[PDB]
């Protein structure tokens, strides 16, 4: 499934993406694919990792009743809309669930 929900665009805008939250308490993450490596790279996770480029500008939120993991990029320095990936588990690369360009 590739429901890229948000290609939204502003120099100071904030984009919120809803993410499938399986709830079996597994690590849930927002990931970013890199063309050079060919492998997706974590930007946000349940484990408190914040990527070097996105220090403090991205936030995660949990709704178990709604089963939603929202990722909020509050300052889009309009850096490349990447093909982002929701996934679960301790394997970021193969654990992806949905894509979100």
């Amino acid at each position: 499934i590739l429901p890229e929900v948000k290609v939204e665009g502003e120099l100071g805008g904030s984009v919120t993406i809803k993410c499938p939250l399986p709830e079996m308490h597994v690590r849930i993450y927002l990931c970013r694919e890199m063309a050079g490596s060919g492998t997706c790279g974590t930007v946000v996770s349940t484990t408190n990792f914040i990527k070097a480029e996105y220090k403090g500008r991205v936030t995660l939120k949990q709704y178990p009743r709604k089963n939603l993991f929202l990722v909020e990029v509050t300052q889009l320095t309009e850096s490349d809309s990447g093909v982002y990936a929701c996934g679960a588990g301790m394997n970021t690369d193969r654990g992806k669930t949905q894509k979100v360009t």
Binding site: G41, T42, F49, A52, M90, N91, T92, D93
Partner: protein, 224 residues
């Protein structure tokens, strides 16, 4: 009122290359010109104060002073006698300290272990560990030297040396450096630098990157 003697550490005499005898007074409040008197065994090492503060949170701050001598003097083993004279303390005195001698020297053996494949699989961070074994003046200073020069001291954590299992005299330490996965994946060398007494010329450098594990002669790739 309370006399403390902080001897120079090998880390300090390596970083600044000038050994730094330390004496301190506690249980006293800071009147003015806070310091501790300074002498060597011959008394020539009369030096100046530093680290002036008005008061402790309990208004009983420890006065601080410093003295300087040649680096080889501390390793010479001779006793060094620093005086203790401050306005707050009732009676001045003097103390003597020296490097503890008669202590076996074993050369450190340094190994660099790359992060496990699982840690890279998480794609969050990766820990390169510098393991130093078989060294026993119980002192080691390990730092990390990548891309030419020194990483911020916050990045790496070095455990206190802990006495080995098999070898009684010889110790060990571990220094973990946590870096993001993409630099490792990229290829980036990260050196580890074990400064130690028992070392030939006191410094040993080791290098690990993504391609160290891979064999160089044969290259077998499985394709589907």
């Amino acid at each position: 009122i309370r006399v403390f003697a902080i001897p120079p550490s090998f880390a300090s005499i390596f970083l600044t290359k000038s050994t730094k005898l330390t004496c301190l007074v506690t249980d006293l409040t800071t009147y003015d010109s806070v310091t501790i008197s300074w002498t060597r065994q011959n008394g020539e090492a009369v030096k100046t104060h530093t680290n002036i503060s008005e008061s402790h949170p309990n208004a009983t701050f420890s006065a601080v002073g410093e003295a300087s001598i040649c680096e080889d003097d501390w390793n010479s083993g001779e006793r060094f006698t620093c005086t203790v004279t401050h306005t707050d303390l009732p009676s001045p005195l003097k103390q003597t300290i020296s490097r503890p001698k008669g202590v076996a020297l074993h050369r450190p053996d340094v190994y660099l272990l790359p992060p496990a494949r699982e840690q890279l699989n998480l794609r969050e961070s990766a820990t390169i560990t510098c393991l130093v074994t078989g060294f026993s003046p119980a002192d080691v200073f390990v730092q990390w030297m990548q891309r030419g020069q020194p990483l911020s001291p916050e990045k790496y954590v070095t455990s206190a040396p802990m006495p080995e299992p098999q070898a009684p005299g010889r110790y060990f330490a571990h220094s973990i450096l946590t870096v993001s996965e993409e630099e490792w994946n990229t290829g980036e060398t990260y050196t580890c630098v074990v400064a130690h007494e028992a070392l030939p010329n006191r410094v040993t450098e080791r290098t690990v990157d993504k391609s160290t594990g891979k064999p160089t002669l044969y290259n077998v790739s499985l394709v589907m």
